Design a protein around this ligand. Sequence first.
Ligand SMILES: [Mg+2]
Ligand SMILES: [Mg+2]
Ligand SMILES: [Mg+2]
Ligand SMILES: [Mg+2]
Lengths: 387, 387, 387, 387
Amino acid sequence: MKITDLELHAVGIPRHTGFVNKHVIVKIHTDEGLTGIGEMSDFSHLPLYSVDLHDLKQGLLSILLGQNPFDLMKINKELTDNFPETMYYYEKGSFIRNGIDNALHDLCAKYLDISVSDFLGGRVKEKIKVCYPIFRHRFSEEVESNLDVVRQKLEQGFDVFRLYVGKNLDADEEFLSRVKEEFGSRVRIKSYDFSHLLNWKDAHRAIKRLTKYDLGLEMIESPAPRNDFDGLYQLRLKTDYPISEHVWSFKQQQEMIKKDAIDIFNISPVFIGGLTSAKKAAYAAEVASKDVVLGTTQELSVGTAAMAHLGCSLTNINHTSDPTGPELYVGDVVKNRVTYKDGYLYAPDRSVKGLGIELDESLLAKYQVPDLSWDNVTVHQLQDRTA
Amino acid sequence: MKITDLELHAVGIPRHTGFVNKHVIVKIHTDEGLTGIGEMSDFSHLPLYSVDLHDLKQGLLSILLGQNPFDLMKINKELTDNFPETMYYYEKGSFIRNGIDNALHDLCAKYLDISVSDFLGGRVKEKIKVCYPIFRHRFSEEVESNLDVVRQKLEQGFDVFRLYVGKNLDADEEFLSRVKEEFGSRVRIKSYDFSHLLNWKDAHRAIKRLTKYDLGLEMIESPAPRNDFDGLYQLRLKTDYPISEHVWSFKQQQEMIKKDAIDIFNISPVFIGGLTSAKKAAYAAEVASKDVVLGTTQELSVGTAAMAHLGCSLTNINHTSDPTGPELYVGDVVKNRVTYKDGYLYAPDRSVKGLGIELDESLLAKYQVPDLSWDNVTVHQLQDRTA
Amino acid sequence: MKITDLELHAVGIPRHTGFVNKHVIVKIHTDEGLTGIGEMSDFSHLPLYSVDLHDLKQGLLSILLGQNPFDLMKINKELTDNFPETMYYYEKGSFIRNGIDNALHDLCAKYLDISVSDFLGGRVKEKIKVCYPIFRHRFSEEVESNLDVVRQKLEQGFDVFRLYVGKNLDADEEFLSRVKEEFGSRVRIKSYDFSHLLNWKDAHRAIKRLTKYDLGLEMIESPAPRNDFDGLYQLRLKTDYPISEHVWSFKQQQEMIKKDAIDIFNISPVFIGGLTSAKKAAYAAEVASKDVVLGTTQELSVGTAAMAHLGCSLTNINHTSDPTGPELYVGDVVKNRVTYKDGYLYAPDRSVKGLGIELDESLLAKYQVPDLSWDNVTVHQLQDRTA
Amino acid sequence: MKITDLELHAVGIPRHTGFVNKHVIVKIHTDEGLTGIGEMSDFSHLPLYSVDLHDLKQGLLSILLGQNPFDLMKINKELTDNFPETMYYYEKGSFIRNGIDNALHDLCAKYLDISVSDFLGGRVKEKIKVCYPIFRHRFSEEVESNLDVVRQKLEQGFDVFRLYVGKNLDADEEFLSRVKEEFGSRVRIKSYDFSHLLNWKDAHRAIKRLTKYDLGLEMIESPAPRNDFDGLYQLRLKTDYPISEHVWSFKQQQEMIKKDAIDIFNISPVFIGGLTSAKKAAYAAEVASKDVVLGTTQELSVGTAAMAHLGCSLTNINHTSDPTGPELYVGDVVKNRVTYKDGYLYAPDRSVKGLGIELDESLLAKYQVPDLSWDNVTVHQLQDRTA
Ligand SMILES: [Mg+2]
Ligand SMILES: [Mg+2]
Ligand SMILES: [Mg+2]
Ligand SMILES: [Mg+2]
């Protein structure tokens, strides 16, 4: 059993918010004809440059060609050796490793005729509560529109959301006020995400005024600059609400643990390099008796299926998670998208081999994009995921 | 696919040193007729009391009955809930969880017709260098005999050993002197193990005089009392040689990491609760960029096969490990013991499904013991594994 | 005065060691016809992926178009906003910002008819002592060859070198022994560079044995993993020799200062984002009363000219620096390379406007490369700069 | 291009408050006839002794004679070597270095026929919000008068002020109450300045009662004794409002950074030694991701012009600054004072070469003073700037 070829299909898929993300669907071929599919999710984050996929294919084939897909530890080591962890939230090399590693999980699972679930430790639950995102307001005039989103998604079953805040505290507070005002306890906003936009003492003042509205608030996320472990700690000591932060590298996670800087570790395959790396981060968190939430970069059904399996295998997830990609994207690349019911992400059928997903070549062709080049976008738009 | 029954076979197997250990071979039965075998290795450690196996079977069946053997995360959680981690090196509950978890790995692997290796991440190497133990000298008159052991095992292929020290520094030094004297660089003693017998400043003085003899010394092990994280740290700062310590609980490992108390994490399934728990500890160590060595309690071929698979899957093992059970025990319970060649433990045939081991009912019956009751043994003998 | 267009010329230039690096020569055009030239130096470092220059041109033009080249603070802010600092040594976005910022310095200087020197604070000296690099030995058989290099460069005027160590301590020591042996005090090796390959306690042991040879040793560089501020500190407390480390981001530099983790801050434009960013790092170091050495990634004459001006403006450089690119590369892209005499890098003629360098279109065309795609190279080769 | 002579013109200029300050206007002459003008601002601060200007001219000429005005790094080094930093807020040597360095910027800019702005990094903005000062009340009877000042300056365009507090908390509170009472939200008091008069726990109690009045409060300044880094830290942890402190020396700034003692670094050329030193402090603050406010000692138009250019070049100024000298002084020494409109300090015309200011010899002669000798003044008056 050995890898013989690799395919990288770039796609451009807009969201209902109008923001257009580019992803790369991965295909790993073997000698026995079995193919694994994966996803390098959302390359549309800073820095403002793009990876050459023709070159990337050679590099990855160079690493993978002839390897036994079951040597995940070995292969992941070589992937990390060629794509070092950078201590940065959106390292494109992490998205790359993720697409390879999750495609390998698909490949291995299909080969054994089992669900990726049974290759990750099984099930602890069959679905995980998630939340729909309301992107940050920079102006008060954006509030009304986001209120329609709440009203609309709530009707479709999502009773839990999360709010990106920090750029205009007045608009943030206005939105929260309007929500409480109109839906009362019908809607919950499980977290206010600062996206590392504020220094901790500034986050502290903002947290203090935003938490006047507690609609089932579960955590405050990224309330300090990237890698400001000490800032996170001081803030963790000053706020009653749990402090969550994303895990984008092992070194960074080690440091937050040593400093006891946070309460909840937001782990998501795409930012840490894949399912193999996510399990490592998750287990490190378990060993440290730390809570975990399944974060997201908002991925397509292939990626969401992968994280769904992993998510339903974790025993230390006691809060609402964030993957709602398929609901946010107007398009997708599979025959049947992962399912969301009542604000819950369902783990794919445990009977279906592999990821429990199937590619739709017509959709691939439809959303096909020549490369990962950027479009006219502003820094603010990239940070807020707006258009 | 569901568990229907459980069997616990107690065996008494003496070592060439004369010390007699009791183990429990595990059998987990399923509805589809597939059975997984495991090992609760070496119950012959303090405290001086024994577990009732009739009662234990009911308790474990109570947890396992009807469960899907693939729900390792779920099952391990319940096992931990019923057998809490105690922060003690020889918690018998850990040996118990270990036998269940490794039998589950055997069961799952057999079911998918693959080697436990392919269920643990694959292979990074095919064998791991190990060392033969020379138990501690309490009197100078024990030296000559242990020299015969070195001479004899060296001839059989083991060129690396490890020495338990601390009770009689004169005898320790005498042995080391005699070895260097007779074998020169032909034999290596990769570590001096204090077994937590000394307070750190005492270990420091002992380390200082013992390290006059460096026959390829790789680490100093357990040079501080159990759980003395600060003592380990101070000592780690005063010694050039790496400091290794056993991982017997997640809380304990978390603390050694936060304090950066050691250089090498000695991880072994039996002391942490099984393959699932060992992978967690191993990954926590990887996330912390810490070195790892595969420790041991000296197990039979069933247990050694399990650790062998795990060992050959780890990427952060850069020193000599310790599992040499089958070489130390006069007896075993399998048709073909795991193989040792040139001081290397070979991972079982990757083609053979499961653990790659086969029980020999005649041997089970031969070494069969009514229970895990103790024999006339002294505290010193239990700490040193002597007779 | 405003920017109207941008040009990115990729070149492939091999070294005498055989390693082939790819660089990008930058041209920023203005409405008044004045053009500034810059250099995005050495993209041939991990991670193993490449940036699309067609896309990059649009992104950068998007930021620069219409801007007044004199608004360095403003422009650098926007550059950082689009290419966030990642806490990683070889962030390609940093190389990119560097090429833009140094071309802007060239543009502004030419506009005022002055040397970039007079735009950076003037001169403190006219030349800076540098050292020629001897790349790391992985095998003893590589020693003889590197000895020829020493003998040969020494004859050409370089009496100071630096050695990359860490992978084969025996070969390192062998080389050092042979040098001392053959040249006595004629040659100096100002530093042993570990390239973050070892954990600090391991570096400590290595440092201890390598420093048996002190041929004018000035510093130990990168003796701890990337961003291991605490490891650097502990080591700084255990070694008499100064500890130097590269500055690859402001956050990272801030942390090393707060922890007093090192003795010498190795600052180089290419890794921190340009001359503007390097001055900031340099001034931060001055405010902290910390020593500074001008590091390097080994750049062409355009980049070397830029760093030369900056280097001769600093008052806190009291050790030998590292930029010897033009001596290491078989080719270059200018009419007259920067000059090295007696192991000193000379700052370009202070009378010549701009960088004091001139592009040679024929050379640009000669070493022209279609893109920044990778060639068959190994991880080891990328870390050691060998072929 | 070389310096040939120096002139120091002492002037005495009273404020509308009646306090009389002495300044020294600087003139640096060159061989090519180009002259740079500068300002050693406000010598009227403790300690109670004065510098001999005849002697000072010899000393400075001794340092400057024959030097190339463009060697700012070199010259500033020599200036610091002759006028060491003392860790004291009002070190007269700092005022001296400032006048020389800013005159050198004027000289260099004129020489290149550009604005000092284009010699400091360009523009990030064209004006900076500033505040008018209300000096501290020692008695309740001083309140009414200061209320007239608010009412009057507000009418002239200044809607933001700052209040010096600490000696009579009752009068402080009375003033604040009266302001809120009469102007509501029309006037803002961006900061309460303690002038290091109180120990931190005392400042904490005072802060607690004064902040009952929040008229757009932006920061609490100098709430701890001079150089009490630990006191600033403890207080920074107990107050929600940002803590700002002046930067009077590199060593002091380094220490506040290492201890993370404050939120806002108040940087002003006069207290740190000039534009060159201010940029260093500013960049150190940028590298540390710390906020900055342009402080002041209240300077004439020459000095205010200099700081204006620097201020409009900084990217990390996100609060209201303090330079309002020309509005506070009844007299000045230029043909056209820097302009203030709507509480904003405007950067001098970017088209005018140099500082964008012109000396008025008649005014120099008018406010001419024989020396910097003191007049009958009390300690309280010197601390509060009252008469
Ligand atoms: Mg995303
Ligand atoms: Mg044992
Ligand atoms: Mg380089
Ligand atoms: Mg003053």
